[PDB]
């Protein structure tokens, strides 16, 4: 990845999973995370209106123009609730660059995805290195695989191993 | 269909199957149809750079803010784009209002869904009402139904049948 990511995810890493993950999302320039940007909402392909880091919900406000700290406040407020949704289902302890990373991973795949899926059956057994690599099999959509997806999954996957090598 | 609607298409229909999309596309506005818009580029939920009605490609500048006469422009060509990708693969006579639905249709899903679709092997069967219906399967994406896409292939479906209703 990037050393440019690399060196905003450290520089993160005291702040815990959450301003991890955020760093991941957002990346250093807020241009330039794993997650596309735009301060005016915009409807994506399958219809959903977005706003802000990606942030979907009935709040939004069609004719507005977020500021750089509205969305500050609904990325912080989004993390919170991706973690909520999946801490739960976590049953051994875990490194907060893991857990950052499965922010990450979630926060762009869904919590339902999460909970059935093999990737977190290998957490709980355990098999934390196994359960990184399963990232890989998420790089599909509309029937096909996608560059970006591999990409992304590639990056989360570094940070979901940064603690384990 | 919204009455705004029927009546751009309707304005449309001399204009052919590409005027027909582009109003489905952008809408009776030119600023809010069945596809999203941005001025801004911006990664899309794949990873893909995209600017304007949905246009990506090698030749967008990432610092550029585009205008709404750039950005029709560009859907004009990838609109040509389209019908080159997906006419040669239509063996039979179909309205101009059906093949605007499909340009719609296809700038949604792509040329390479539409090549081996039952859809497709309905149109060169003859079969016009039975593609037409097969747009109401094209709703799932990541595992599920989307509400969005319902009502985009309802509104496409409406319009690959204007001619025989």
Redesign the interface.
């Known amino acids: 990845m990037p050393p440019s990511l690399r060196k905003a995810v450290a520089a993160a890493i005291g702040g815990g999973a959450i301003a991890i993950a955020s760093v991941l999302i957002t990346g250093p320039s807020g241009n330039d995370g794993?997650?596309?940007?735009?301060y005016?909402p915009?409807?994506?392909?399958?219809?959903?209106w977005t706003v802000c880091h990606?942030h979907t919900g009935k709040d939004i406000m069609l004719g507005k123009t977020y500021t750089k700290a509205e969305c500050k406040a609904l990325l912080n407020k989004d993390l919170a609730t991706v973690a909520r949704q999946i801490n739960p289902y976590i049953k051994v302890d875990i490194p907060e660059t893991m857990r950052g990373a499965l922010y990450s991973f979630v926060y762009?795949?869904?919590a339902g995805?999460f909970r059935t899926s093999t990737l977190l059956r290998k957490i709980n057994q355990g098999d934390i290195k196994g359960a990184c690599d399963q990232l890989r099999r998420w790089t599909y959509?509309?029937?096909?695989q996608?560059?970006?997806?591999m990409?992304?999954r590639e990056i989360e996957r570094e940070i979901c191993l940064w603690g384990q090598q």
Chains 1, 2 share one sequence.
């Open positions: 794993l997650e596309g940007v735009s005016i915009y409807k994506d392909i399958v219809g959903v990606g762009n795949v869904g995805n959509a509309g029937g096909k996608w560059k970006g997806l990409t992304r």
